Each structure stands twice: as C-alpha cells, then as structure tokens.
Design a protein around this ligand. Structure first.
Ligand SMILES: Cc1cc2nc3c(=O)[nH]c(=O)nc-3n(C[C@H](O)[C@H](O)[C@H](O)COP(=O)(O)O)c2cc1C
Ligand SMILES: Cc1cc2nc3c(=O)[nH]c(=O)nc-3n(C[C@H](O)[C@H](O)[C@H](O)COP(=O)(O)O)c2cc1C
Ligand SMILES: Cc1cc2nc3c(=O)[nH]c(=O)nc-3n(C[C@H](O)[C@H](O)[C@H](O)COP(=O)(O)O)c2cc1C
Ligand SMILES: Cc1cc2nc3c(=O)[nH]c(=O)nc-3n(C[C@H](O)[C@H](O)[C@H](O)COP(=O)(O)O)c2cc1C
Ligand SMILES: O=C(CSc1nc[nH]n1)N1CCN(c2cccc(Cl)c2)CC1
Ligand SMILES: O=C(CSc1nc[nH]n1)N1CCN(c2cccc(Cl)c2)CC1
Ligand SMILES: O=C(CSc1nc[nH]n1)N1CCN(c2cccc(Cl)c2)CC1
Ligand SMILES: O=C(CSc1nc[nH]n1)N1CCN(c2cccc(Cl)c2)CC1
Lengths: 341, 341, 341, 341
C-alpha cells in the first residue's frame, strides 16, 4: 500500500477488514444524511489565507484542559479497537505517546483503563464515560481513571439509547468470539441509562475534581446549561453521525456553541475531520482542538500502532501546511477572518 | 426477506408486484418533481436535539379530532388495496386495530365501508370522500360512515380532475379483472365533479355532524377559508405528488398552514413520511399527526395484515427513538426549536 | 411509438433523424449551460394551487397583439423545418390552423412567405425578421408579410452574429442538398448585419404599421427602450440558448421585464417550454403567451402535420389540467400568487 | 484531431502525454475542491447582454501595466513547459508574439530568461519571480529580466511551501532526465523561502523600477497592503488551485479585491479561464485582463507553437463573440451590469 491521505487508509481498511467490522466502524444512523454532511459541511467553509506573514517556524502546539499537546488533533473514543488490530487501544495509546497528543479512551474499550495507562504511562489520556444504570460501576470507572493518571472525563450525553445503524442490524453485529469490553443496540438498552438528566451531571460534578467535558452537545442552550453545572468543556459532537440522523454537521453548529459559552469553557469538535484544512477551519471558528474517530481505526486496520502513528502524522503535516499557506505561524493567530461559509 | 426500514418494504414490493401495479402505487404526476421533493424536503429540515432530559418513559400517544391514538402516525387513504394483497383494506384495518392507530378508508376502496367496519370494529376509522357528480351516492357514503362508526370525513379537495401519471397511461392502467371499487383518469372524468366549490363544502358541513377535514390544502388563504366554513382540520397534502406536479413538498408548506389557522383546527400532514425523524419534524412544525400512504401498500404487498403491522411498528419504533434522542418524553414537548431549515 | 409527453417526441426524433440534423435542432451555444437552465429554472418555480374554485369549464383562449388564439401556446420560429419532414413549414401552419393558434415563420424557412400563407390562409401567422445587411431584401420580406396577411413582425435582436454551437462545427452543418432558404455561422456572418442599433428599429417602426415585437430581450432597460421606440411587445428569449451561453433562463428574467414595461406592451416568453405547468408559470409571472421552438420540430420529425398537431394538443391538454388543478377557470384569473421561487 | 474549444485540447493532451506529466499539469491540491470551483464559479455568474448596440467593429485591444496588448487574455506562468513539447517556453513566446499578447515566464522554466527574450524579442514578456532563500540568485533573475527587456515582475506570494498535489506524490513527480530548470515539494522546501514577509516586498520594490504585480492575493486587506508597499497590480490567483485547497474561486473573490484597491492599481485574474465568456465576466467585475495557465500547456502538447497559437486564437474568437453578443464594441464599455451572481 501507498497511503498518503486519510481517505487512502479508509480504502485500505475496507480491503482488509471483514464487511461486518468495516460496516460497524463506517456506519452512521439510518439514511446516513448527517454522516455525509459532517464531511460536506467542511467543504462549504472557504478559507481566506493571508500572504507574506513569515511561516518558516510553524508551531502546532496547544493545550487541552491545561495539558500541553503537540497539535490540536487528538484521538476520540471509538469502541472495541481490538476488532481492527490485535493490539487495539494499546497500539493507539502508544502512537499518541509518540506524537505528543491525547487519547480519549472509550468506556466500551477492548482494553482496561489500567492496561491502557500501563501501555502509555507518559501519554495524555482521558476517559470517555457513559452513565450506566449501575452507578457503582460508573463510579468505579471514574475512580480507576483518577488512580491511573487520566486527566479528564468526557461524559457522553447524546446516547440515552443507541442510534439505529442499519448495516449492524443486517449483519446482527456482535464482538468476535475472543474479544470482550474489558472494563450493541440491545447491550445499550440493557446497560446505558436513558433516564439521565442534568441531576446526574450534578452527581458526576460532585464525584470527581477531574475536568469534565460534555460530549455530544449540539445546542447553545444545552452548552450554557453545561457551563452552569460547572463542567470544564463542551465537545461539539453528533457521535460521528451514529445517533440521531438529520442533525447538522458539527462544523456548522460549532459557531453557535462557541458564542453561547462566551469563553467560559474550551469548545472542541469531532465529526468528519479528515484533512488538515478541517482542523484549521474548526480552530478558526473557535474550537481549541478537534478529535478524530474513524481515521484512527483505519490506522489500526493498516498496521496497528505504526498505522495510527501514520494517520496522526499525516493530519499533523496537512495541518502544518494549511497553517503555513494561510499565514499562521502558531495556533494563537488562527482567527475567524480565515473562514466564510 | 430481512426488511428493517420502510425503503426495504418498497424494494420488496417492486420485486413481487406486477410492474403496472407497482407503477400505479409508486407513480407521481408528470415528471415527478414533487414526488422527489416530498422526500428531499424532509432531509433539508435539520434536528437540534436536547440532551439530558430523561427519556426512560417515552409516551407516543396523542389524539386526532378528540380520539386517542397510540402514536401520531395514521394510515392514509390509498385506493384499491386488494391489488397489493387479497385481504386489501381488511388487512389494513386489522393492523390499525392491533397498533391502536386510525385508518382513513379510500372512497375508491376494494372493500365496502361496512366490510371494513366489520373487520376492524374496535379500530379508529375515518372515511375519505370525493364529492361525486351524483350527490345521492355522495350522501349515501357519508350516511354509511356515520352508521358504521367512522369518526370523521376527510374530504379530498385537490382532485377536480385526476393528475396525469405517465406510467399509468403507458400501462393503460385498470383494475385486475376480479376486483371492483366495492362502494382511472377516464373514471374520475366520468364520476368526480370538477365544479365543486366552497358552496359544496357548506353542503357537506350541513350534511353531517361528524368532524370534517379538508385534505389537499396547500395555501394559507384556503386553510383560513376551510376554518371559516366550519371544518375541523386541514390535512396538508399534495395527494402523494400525484395531482399537480411542481407544488412544494408538504413539510415545506406545513408552517404557513399552521400559522394561517392560528390554532383553530388541527393540522395534519402526508406526503413523503418514511422515517421516524419525518414524523418528529412534522410535529415540531405544528402538525398533530401524519398520515402514510405508500408504505402501507408496501406492507400489504409483503404480507398483508402482518406486513402493514410491521411497517407501522417500524415507524413507531423509529419515532420513539427519534423522540428519545431529541429529549422528548411525550408529544406535548416536541417544540419548534427542534428544527431549522 | 406511444408518445404521450413532449420529451417522448424528442426521444423519437433522436431515433429517426440523422445525427447532424438532430444535433442542429437540439444544440445550444458552447457548454450549453443556458440550455439546461431554460428547463431547470421552470422546476425551481413552485406552484401554489387554489382548491374548490369550480373548474368544470376551463377556457384556455386568449389574445396575442389583439388576435384571438385558442390557447396561450404558439409556434416559435425554427429554421429549415423541411430538414425534419418533407412538408416542413406547410405541415406546421396547417397544424396551427387546426389548433386555432399562431405560427411565427422563420426568416430562414425552407418555405416562402407566400407558400405558408397559401397552406394556412385562415391560420394566425407572424413573420420573424432578421435585419439583413441588404435593407432592400429586408423591406421585401416585410412587404410580403403585409401582402400575405401576416399579423405581426417579430424582429430578432440578439443575433448580430450566430452563436457558437459546437456540434454544428464538429458536423460542419449545412442544408441537405435538395433544400434552400426559400425566401450557418458563415452564412450569418455574410448576410446578417452586426451593426444594427436602435436607429434600425426606428427604421423598421417607420417601414410597417404591423405590430412589431422585439425578440431576444433579456434586460429591463432594453425592454423600456423597445417601448420608447413604439414597439408593441417583447418576446423574452435567449434564442433557445443558442446565442450567448450563460445568460439566465427566460422564466427567471421574465418578472424583471414584465415590471420594466409597466403594462405598456404584451410580454411573451420562449425557451424551455415543454409542459403545461411551464405555460402556467409563465402566465402567472405576467407573460401573455409562450412560444415553443424545438417541440414543434420533434412533432414534424414524428409525423409532419399530424405530429405538430399532437405536440400542440399535448401542451393544450397539459395546460388545461394545470389550470384546472390550480383553480383557474380561464387565463384572466392566473395570478402572481400561484408561483414562488 | 478536430479541436474547436479549450476542453478539446485538454482531452487531446490526456491522450498523448504520459500520465505523470498530464497529472502534474492537471492536478490541484488535496481533494481538488478549489480546482472544480475555479470553473464552476464562472457558470454561477450570469450574463445580462445588451441588444442593438452596433458590434460590427469589435476591438479587443487593451493595455497591461501601460503596454498595449491585442486582447485582455495573456499567458500565465506554468513551470517546465518542455515536458509538454520539445520547444517549451520558446514555442509559447513565439505564439504570444504572433497574437500580440504577453507571456509571463515562470521562474521554474525549462528555458532561460535570455533564451525566451531571444525567441520572442518583439513579444511582451514579464517574469514571474519566487523569492528564493538565496537573495543573490533572486536579484540575478530580476536584473536579467531588466537587461532582457521584460516589462514587469509578477512576484508569487502564495507559495511559502508547495501545496500537496496527491497525484505527484503517487507518481513521485520529477523532471524527465534530459530537462532542467534552465535559470517538486522537496525542491521548494530546499529553495523557496517560507519566511518572506512584507519586509521582503519592500526589498523587491527597492531592487527594481519595473512594475511589480503581487500574484496570489485572495484578501482585500492583503491587496490594500500591496498598494501601500508601492506595487503596481494584483493578480487575483489561487495558483490554479494547487496551493491551499478550499479557498474560493478567483472570480468570486475578484469583486472584493477590485473594491479594496479603489482603482489605485490594475487587478488581474487567473484560475479556471477556459472560454470567452469567462474573460467577459472577469472584465465586467473589474479585472483589466486575465491569465491562462493550463490551456497553454494543452496547446503545447498538441503542436507546440502552433497549438499555443490555436488555443489563444480560440479564446480570442470566443471573447470577440461574447463581447459582440453582449453589446460591447470594445473593452472600455464592458460594465458591472453585464453580470449578476
Ligand atoms: C466505530 C465507532 C465507535 C464509537 N464508539 C464510541 C464510544 O465508545 N464512545 C463515544 O462516546 N463515542 C463513540 N463514538 C463516537 C466518536 O467518539 C466520535 O464522536 C466520532 O467518531 C467522531 O467522528 P469521526 O469518526 O467522523 O471522526 C464512536 C464512533 C465510531 C465511528
Ligand atoms: C396508490 C395511491 C392511491 C391513492 N388513493 C387515494 C384515494 O383514494 N383518495 C385520496 O384522497 N388520496 C389518495 N391517495 C393520496 C394519499 O391519501 C396520500 O395523500 C399520499 O399517499 C401521501 O403520500 P405518501 O404516499 O408519500 O405517504 C393515494 C395515493 C397513492 C400513492
Ligand atoms: C433549430 C432552431 C432553429 C431556430 N431558428 C430560429 C430562427 O430562424 N429565427 C429566430 O429568430 N429564432 C430561431 N430559433 C429560436 C426560436 O425562435 C426560439 O427562441 C427557441 O426555439 C425557443 O426555445 P425552445 O426551443 O426551448 O422552445 C431557433 C431555435 C432552434 C432550436
Ligand atoms: C502545471 C502548472 C505549473 C505552474 N507553475 C507555476 C509557476 O512556475 N509559477 C507560478 O507562479 N505559478 C505557477 N502556476 C500557477 C499559474 O501561474 C496560474 O496561477 C494558474 O495556472 C492559473 O489557472 P489555470 O491553469 O486554471 O488557467 C502553475 C500552474 C500549473 C497548472
Ligand atoms: O448498568 C450496568 C448493568 S445495569 C443492568 N440492568 C440489567 N442487567 N444489568 N453495567 C453497565 C456498566 N458495565 C461496564 C462498563 C464497561 C465495560 C464493562 Cl465490563 C462493564 C456493565 C454493567
Ligand atoms: O357521480 C357518479 C356517477 S356521475 C355519472 N355521470 C355519468 N355517469 N355517471 N357516481 C360516482 C360515485 N360512485 C361510487 C363511489 C365509490 C365507489 C362506487 Cl361503486 C361508486 C359511482 C357513480
Ligand atoms: O444581406 C443579404 C446579403 S448582404 C451580402 N453581403 C455580401 N453578399 N451578400 N441578403 C440577406 C437576406 N437574404 C434572404 C433572406 C432570407 C432568405 C433568402 Cl433567399 C434571402 C439573402 C441576402
Ligand atoms: O535559494 C536557493 C538555494 S537556497 C539553498 N539552501 C540549501 N541549498 N540551497 N536557490 C534557489 C534559486 N535558484 C534558481 C532559480 C530558478 C532556477 C534555477 Cl537553476 C535556480 C536555485 C538555488
């Protein structure tokens, strides 16, 4: 293989993965309107580059919730990574450690919170949390994250029930027989609490002093409520278009959310990030950093840790080039005048 | 067959029905611009879901013209259902009775008003009426509906003449030889009155104390006239895109009609409803309930009563999921802020 | 053949005509952007039909420049009709006489002004005129039209040079050897005057008392100048998209032109009329009548006079149905509220 | 071959050039969104032609930076023309001399500044300059241009680094073994200075009294800065969509730049010019002249000097026709009312 951009990695993954596994990772909810729009929406935002600014020294570094990262490009939570590669989440965290960026670990990982901390002790690591009907197991996951040097909790708030991904139903999706959630619609309905409310966010805010990011907010009123509840960031996310279909693209709702929080908390984005220009557009519209979901799984499917490292390095280099061609020597000078819809 | 969404049922129906029968049900008028737009328009309306609202208890129940239904999803009038399945309208009403929703019976049914009441005595049933040049047969249909416990009249107002559906002309459409309208362009021209005016609506309003819904209104001025004539609802309908081609999608004209009637009568929608999110969008824009036409015929073509039950259950479950993912525990909290075009 | 709409006639014509002849009639200028848009633009204008208006009696009759016609659908000038059928313009005028509508005869006809008057003595006939460098032959054509009972002059104003139709260049277009202009880019450059100005319109206005329509106006300022020069109508036309490519669709510029002339002269439209709803949209936006170009040639290619009669009857019937379904009993009640873009 | 429009020349070039060479010339950056939009954007600008203006005498002549040219259509800088035809830049300048238009010579030419002046002594010639890390070689190129009768410097300002053109990476692009830059991403990174700032523009303004045009400006604020630094024109350019992908089409940003410079310097356009109507639209929006890149390379690939002459003659004739059909006898009367988006 000669893979030189993120799409090439997806095409390689489709070629090597069983159909059911490829479909599980690629699929969006229902007719997949939002899945298409998470990508298409980035193309509608046009870039207005400044010339002659001195971009010999391009510095991609930034910080996420007070922790330094090498680039505003971080690994989002994607379940059951051992389906893509035998090393699964341990491959991913090692690549993140190499790159100097952070990994958000799925609550539905095929590797334990401790296993991932042991594989990536110097890596920036965060835990994505679902509030389970069993609040004891929920609390155990938070306490394990604290003990094992995870630096934030990303609480997923858009999944009271699992979205309806048709290909998983056609393929009756399940984990391969040798794998386990080491810490799907039927499983969520049995385990994930559809009752959670802002009162549960008050509970979680009381449970941990770790920073908490609300993941899956799409409305400014909800973002302002998250700020009121003492949370420390908002990840603007439509869950990779896998929950409610027909919501807007995340890049289209990002400006409303940035306006609504009035700088009180960091705002992040995921959904459809494939290219360095996507990263640049998200930062111009006020995101501190973006998260990538599917591209990491395609990296694993190609070559485990090295394939994840390659995907992150391609995004890093595309982002550096996009910054340099736009006249940006660092992330602090990426401003709103760089983009227009 | 493994049919898990309404499109799958259409694909199955195309596979099993004779071409002329499939084309009769699928076809729209002329170049079928409105037929495409009734579906496309739903995709342009984007959903803005609220998180963390407590959706453990989702209640889909509502009422139509004062009668309770299990869901805001009802069966619209589609002619000559015995072409799709031997049990035709009797299969449909039995499924409606099972589901707890209502059936609008076509004036051009392959089963009599009494036959359908006998098959579905506990089912909520309404009669769709055409004003025939023969006012005696028109009055006989209304009196039969009253005697047989139908609960409303839906008077179709957009069919002074039949629309021009090219495939029916190519196929010279007729009923199979064993079937009869037990109570097509050539038939309408011989039987349906192209002279009807608001004076005929005054006549019908005087004829029955049953609630009367005007079906096929697309303009706010006409909706206000229907309110002035003492009618009890408006079904925003372009007749499944089979009459005048190039009218707007019903979801696009629904907000004008809801504004125009100022809450004086219930407003309903049909045309292009295929998914639970379509139902949610229509209710967010102020419809009390929606009607489905073609999907019911595809249910019959698959397995008669069980196929209609399956299609209604798929719509019910998609609608519950869409409500839950949007933060709606019941239909009363589905508000206009959930959608933006 | 079973031809039931105008597109079917085009498909039949492509099947029976030599490629060069089909391409000559079908082609637009350059990349054919306007050719596509003359049709696409009609689909963007949506219809807002009134219900319950009494359309038992639909009267399609109107008048063009004071002469009664059976329908607001008239035959536009298309050159060299004997390439499509041996009877050419004589077939066309006979069909117009049968239908009770008017024929605009091309200055580049394969039949003489007298021949066409002899074939269609009771037909409403107008002459389309090019101002030739030879003003004597120009004056001879006008005087012949007057002597032979033609009722107006349509002076084409958008052709100082011929547009560049690539397929004609690829096919090195010429008349078949047995045919003559009985009264192409190379021919225009030799014969049509690229110098004509409003001073030539003053000359033509002085030459004849016949009504004069300016054909090919696309700007309101030019329409107001035509009114100032004493002309009696404006045919909003982009020459069937065969002159300057990238001009707007005629249905899109029609409202500006109707506004600009402030009711001082009749406004007509051609370009992309294929369906009765196209006619209805043009009249709702203020055109008195529309002209059809290519559909008449496809009628000839099918069956000469009978094929032209069939195409005109299909347009008539589609227009009646569109009027009836929109609530219009006559052309005088077709109003601007029937359409929105 | 029968090539009658610029697209035909591209199709011919794809048929005769090695894939890597065709791809080098055709390719845009990354997903090639801007490459598509440079063409698509021209089609969105519609023309509003005036009739009856007297276009017997069409005069295409204009001036660029005070030098007369035969048409507002000039040859832009395209590297390494000897890859397309053995005579490369010498063929191009000879064709420019024949046509009476100007040639912008690439700093990355396969022919020297002196060689091209020797082949085209009477041709209007300008030098496109990159500011190399080696300011001595930069100054040598400027002094050579002055000594050899070049009339302006076009300083490229949008290339601190080379854009990422995927096909060149797939094909590991290099010059054929017999060719040299007689005066690619890896080469730029080694030779082109990513540090250049407006201070380097002050240096260049001090170095030469020749007119200097800033090539690659896309923002009005940058255009105003170029005016402040004493430059003499702005070439609105996205580098043929080969640098930052997702910038707007040049025809879409041209009006902002023309407004921003308030007539203080000439404004030019390149990017997507293929047709005479493209030239007309650019002049209506205020460009003095346009530059063509790829079409010249396709002319060379067809037949060297004669193929470049043919492409320039096709553009000239399409432009004359577009001017004549729009009512423009000369370039001075091409006004903003001819276009609307
Ligand atoms: C295969 C797959 C599994 C996912 N698993 C989880 C999960 O365990 N937890 C979670 O909160 N989100 C999960 N998501 C959502 C991602 O965190 C993220 O929002 C999404 O992948 C971003 O969009 P992208 O894939 O377009 O980059 C998953 C997404 C995918 C594609
Ligand atoms: C096959 C077919 C038959 C129909 N028959 C009738 C009819 O008898 N009476 C009526 O008022 N509308 C009739 N309609 C219109 C439907 O009541 C309804 O407006 C339409 O089907 C809704 O759109 P949908 O098919 O996209 O759900 C018919 C529609 C179809 C597709
Ligand atoms: C084959 C062809 C020949 C034409 N010949 C003439 C002509 O002789 N005189 C003229 O003024 N316009 C001529 N036109 C333009 C037509 O009068 C008319 O503007 C155009 O056909 C209308 O668009 P339609 O073909 O889409 O109906 C011609 C058009 C076509 C397609
Ligand atoms: C093959 C190729 C080589 C180019 N080489 C150069 C170059 O040497 N210098 C430069 O400033 N721009 C260069 N450009 C950009 C062109 O000057 C010009 O901006 C662009 O070709 C215009 O768009 P067009 O190709 O759509 O006409 C190049 C473009 C192409 C396609
Ligand atoms: O809420 C529940 C069960 S509630 C219930 N109701 C009926 N049966 N069970 N838990 C979810 C979290 N928990 C977990 C989280 C991640 C991975 C693993 Cl192993 C475990 C599983 C169990
Ligand atoms: O208006 C008419 C006939 S008027 C007329 N003019 C010339 N011949 N007939 N009726 C329509 C309603 N009627 C009906 C409605 C539904 C089904 C059945 Cl069987 C019957 C049929 C007959
Ligand atoms: O203006 C001219 C010729 S001017 C000229 N310059 C150099 N050679 N000729 N006429 C055009 C009208 N005329 C005509 C119009 C329609 C059909 C027929 Cl047969 C004839 C042909 C001749
Ligand atoms: O800036 C440099 C080299 S700077 C450097 N750093 C490490 N190695 N070299 N020059 C560029 C211009 N120059 C040129 C311009 C056009 C063609 C030709 Cl032959 C030559 C080549 C060399």
């Amino acid at each position: 293989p000669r893979l030189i951009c993120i799409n090439d990695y997806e095409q390689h993954a489709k070629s090597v993965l069983p159909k059911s596994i490829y479909d599980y990772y690629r699929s969006g909810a229902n007719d997949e309107e939002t899945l298409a729009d998470n990508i298409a929406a980035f193309s509608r935002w046009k870039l207005y580059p400044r010339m002659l600014r001195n971009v010999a020294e391009t510095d991609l570094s930034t910080s996420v919730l007070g922790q330094r990262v090498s680039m505003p490009i971080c690994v989002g939570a994607t379940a059951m990574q051992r389906m893509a590669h035998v090393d699964g989440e341990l491959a991913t965290v090692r690549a993140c450690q190499s790159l100097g960026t952070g990994m958000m670990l799925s609550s539905w990982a095929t590797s334990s919170i401790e296993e991932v901390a042991e594989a990536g002790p110097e890596a920036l690591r965060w835990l994505q949390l679902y509030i389970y009907k069993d609040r004891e197991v929920t609390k155990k996951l938070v306490r394990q994250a604290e003990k094992m040097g995870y630096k934030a909790i990303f609480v997923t708030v858009d999944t009271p029930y699992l979205g309806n991904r048709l290909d998983d139903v056609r393929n009756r999706f399940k984990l391969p027989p040798q794998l386990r959630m080491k810490n799907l619609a039927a499983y969520v309905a049995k385990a994930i609490d559809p009752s959670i409310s802002w009162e549960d966010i008050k509970w979680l805010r009381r449970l941990t002093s770790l920073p908490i990011v609300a993941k899956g907010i799409l409305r400014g009123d909800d973002a302002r409520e998250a700020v009121k509840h003492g949370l420390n960031g908002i990840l603007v996310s439509n869950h990779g278009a896998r929950q409610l279909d027909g919501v807007p693209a995340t890049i289209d709702v990002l400006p409303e959310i940035v306006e609504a929080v009035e700088g009180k908390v960091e705002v992040f984005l995921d959904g459809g990030v494939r290219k360095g220009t996507d990263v640049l557009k998200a930062l111009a519209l006020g995101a501190k950093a973006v998260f990538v979901g599917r591209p990491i799984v395609w990296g694993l499917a190609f070559q485990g840790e090295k394939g994840v490292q390659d995907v992150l390095e391609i995004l890093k280099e595309e982002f550096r080039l996009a910054m340099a061609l736009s006249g940006c020597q660092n992330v602090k000078v990426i401003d709103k005048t760089l983009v227009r819809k």
